[PDB]
Design a protein around this ligand. Structure first.
Ligand SMILES: *OP(=O)(O)OC[C@H]1O[C@@H](n2cnc3c(N)ncnc32)[C@H](O)[C@@H]1O
Ligand SMILES: [Mg+2]
Ligand SMILES: [Mg+2]
Ligand SMILES: [Mg+2]
Ligand SMILES: [Mg+2]
Ligand SMILES: [Mg+2]
Length: 642
DNA sequence: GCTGATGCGTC
DNA sequence: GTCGGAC
DNA sequence: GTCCGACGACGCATCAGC
């Protein structure tokens, strides 16, 4: 009702009508969304964030139902269903230019402040706009802002960037209080609330459970939990939370779910939104494990299967009744246009009795001349959009490992033993085109160790381990990481570790604001007696170790780089460091780099070598730079991968 | 018509 | 993708 | 164990700038 500036969606006994900061039927103000973001950001307990978001959503349901979908998208920082491919195309560069123009400041001055503060939002809000007149424009609304975000994402073609900057400036001109901070963070793709998809779903089921949609105004039922004991309320909300969560994992599309929720309610939701081919679903993921002993501990006495973990890209393959075929990525992006070859071979992989299906597969680059798997880096050279089958140069072999839907039957609640059997009996293998994941059903620790050894020898990353009957379903809402990934480089003493020289540091963003978030590392090239940048590094250290690194490196800061340090195309560090510290670094593999100079010319004329999945292990106090891993040793390690 | 910077995607 | 922090 | 956001290499698609 009153000024949204005082809106407190975190207040005790929050009343969806009386504590709202707008009137019935009015559009939700964006400042209401922003104050909710502030109250979420101030706390660290997710459950407190969920209650706060729930309070906002209850007011939205009660007062302004049409703004529910935009508010949810704003809270996720999404533009729409992932398979529709809406993208801002903005990024820090465009955003920082728009902030500069809106405030009249120099781009470079804005850039330096952002790096220092580790946050663009604070730079955007703390500086006023030259564009603004004496009179402010009307206040921003949640749906107004969301549609402008969509406008940005739809702009294409020549001069589209200028048009994007104009929209962004228009937004900043109208911002009040904390609004610009979250507009800017949203545009840069770093909203960083500490609340995301799972907490948004929890807030949404709680909200529509406590404040049902569809009530004649004023709503007779503002809080449907008030008549319940605390224990009964909790059980009820957990039950309703799982209805929404399991539906969303089968149909992760708020454009479909929300209209149903507002019309028919949450209890009827599964009868209106169900898994079907053509709608991407959430995939089953995996937890790491440190060794075979641990696998047996997590699965106890449950029979399990081991499978090769292939190194390609996940492909969720849908065949609709009537013949249409769709392919989606692990993240529900539409990849149908990328695999014309796969689409044309569907008739060859399925027996003629199969009328529809959803397969879970790995797409792996395959050398038809040598009949062998190719590295991930080869796979990534495929074109991605509007590919014509004749133009394909990198062939793919599909390694199928699960089946989620068959002939109109959803298999989500079926044990893997049965899903696998339907997969094996209704689909046809062809060497180099479509094959079942190589597997072993055993409890013998010795066979597992060999089978692991062999998976590496056969061009794979290690093993995936899955129970067959006990907790062996495909219900992502019950456990999204139900499988176990046993990679060689997880083992504490088998992976390849390098001793690398710290040559630069990058100021941290977000959670790393105010310290270093990343470092530039180098190997030692003994031929030229120079240090060659090899990779950046930003994970593996605890917060405590990261504080010690800032302490021990601050004395090594230099105004200018050393002439025997070569970084070529790498990101220039915010702070150059006198080469001295040597860290032990682990990786999964070495890759051919278009930018890093380390070992350039030893394996390839144009490309140096970098690290795949690098992480800090520990400081090497017993090593000086001249004894770090050499560039020749790096080349030798790369060749060793064959 | 070409190239480079870069946003977004894959991992 | 890996990793650590807060719960 | 869950959920989240720090941070990694790298390649296609796109568009500003030539
Ligand atoms: O490393 P990670 O957590 O992303 O691993 C999960 C991914 O591994 C791929 N993959 C390859 N082979 C398999 C099998 N046999 N089973 C399950 N997943 C597999 C997937 O692409 C998955 O996303
Ligand atoms: Mg997307
Ligand atoms: Mg775009
Ligand atoms: Mg930076
Ligand atoms: Mg993989
Ligand atoms: Mg560590």
């Amino acid at each position: 009702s009153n000024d949204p500036s005082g809106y407190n969606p975190a207040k005790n006994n929050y009343h969806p009508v009386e504590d709202a900061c707008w009137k019935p039927g009015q559009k939700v103000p964006y400042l209401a969304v922003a104050r909710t973001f502030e109250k979420i950001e101030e706390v660290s307990a997710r459950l407190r964030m969920v209650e706060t978001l729930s309070n906002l959503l209850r007011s939205v349901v009660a007062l302004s139902p049409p703004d529910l979908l935009p508010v949810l998208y704003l809270s996720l920082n999404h533009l729409g269903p992932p398979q529709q491919g809406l993208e801002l195309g903005v990024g820090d560069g465009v955003l920082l230019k728009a902030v500069a123009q809106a405030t009249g400041r120099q781009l470079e001055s804005v850039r330096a402040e952002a790096a220092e503060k580790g946050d663009v939002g604070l730079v955007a809000e703390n500086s006023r706009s030259t564009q603004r007149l004496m009179l402010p424009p009307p206040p921003l609304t949640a749906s107004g802002v969301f549609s402008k975000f969509r406008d940005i994402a739809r702009l294409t073609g020549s001069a589209s960037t200028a048009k994007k900057i104009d929209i962004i400036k228009g937004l900043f001109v109208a911002c009040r209080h904390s609004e610009a901070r979250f507009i800017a963070r949203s545009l840069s793709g770093r909203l960083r609330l500490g609340l995301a998809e799972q907490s948004v779903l929890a807030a949404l089921s709680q909200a529509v459970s406590l404040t049902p949609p569809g009530q004649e105004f004023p709503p007779a039922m503002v809080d449907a939990g008030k008549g319940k004991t605390a224990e009964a309320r909790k059980t009820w909300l957990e039950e309703q939370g799982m209805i929404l969560k399991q539906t969303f994992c089968e149909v992760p599309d708020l454009d479909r779910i929300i209209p149903v929720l507002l019309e028919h309610g949450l209890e009827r939701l599964p009868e209106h939104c169900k898994l079907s081919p053509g709608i991407p679903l959430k995939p089953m993921l995996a937890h790491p494990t440190r060794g075979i002993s641990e696998v047996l501990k997590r699965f106890e006495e449950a029979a399990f299967t081991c499978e090769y973990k292939y190194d390609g890209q996940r492909a969720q393959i849908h065949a609709l009744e009537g013949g249409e075929v769709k392919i989606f990525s692990r993240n529900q992006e539409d990849n149908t246009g990328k695999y014309p070859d796969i689409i044309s071979r569907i008739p060859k992989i399925k027996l003629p009795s199969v009328t529809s299906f959803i397969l879970d597969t790995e797409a792996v680059a395959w050398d038809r001349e040598k009949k062998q798997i190719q590295p991930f880096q080869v796979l990534t050279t495929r074109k991605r959009k509007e590919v014509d089958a004749s133009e394909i140069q990198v062939q793919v072999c599909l390694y199928a490992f699960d089946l989620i839907y068959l002939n109109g039957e959803s298999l989500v609640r079926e044990p893997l033993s049965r899903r696998r059997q339907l997969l094996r009996e209704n689909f046809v293998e062809t060497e180099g085109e479509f094959v079942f994941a190589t597997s072993l059903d055993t409890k013998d620790i010795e066979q597992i160790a060999e089978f692991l050894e062999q998976s590496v020898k056969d061009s794979c990353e290690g093993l995936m381990v899955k129970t067959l009957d006990v907790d062996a379903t495909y219900e992502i809402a019950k456990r999204s990481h139900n499988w176990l990934k046993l990679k060689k480089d997880y083992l504490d003493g088998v992976g390849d570790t390098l001793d690398l020289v710290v040559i630069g540091a990058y100021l941290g963003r977000g959670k790393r604001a105010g310290r270093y978030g990343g470092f530039l590392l180098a190997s030692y090239d003994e031929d030229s007696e120079e240090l060659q940048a090899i990779c950046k590094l930003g994970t593996g250290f605890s917060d405590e170790e990261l504080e010690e690194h800032h302490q021990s490196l601050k004395a090594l800061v230099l105004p200018s780089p050393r002439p025997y340090v070569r970084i070529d195309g790498a990101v220039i560090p915010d702070h150059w460091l006198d080469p001295s510290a040597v860290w032990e670094v682990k990786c999964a593999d070495l890759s051919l780099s278009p930018i890093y100079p380390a070992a350039r010319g030893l394996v390839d004329s144009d490309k140096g070598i970098s690290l795949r999945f690098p992480r800090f292990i520990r400081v090497r106090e017993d090593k000086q730079p001249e004894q770090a891993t050499t560039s020749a040793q790096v080349a030798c390690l790369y060749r060793k991968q064959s």
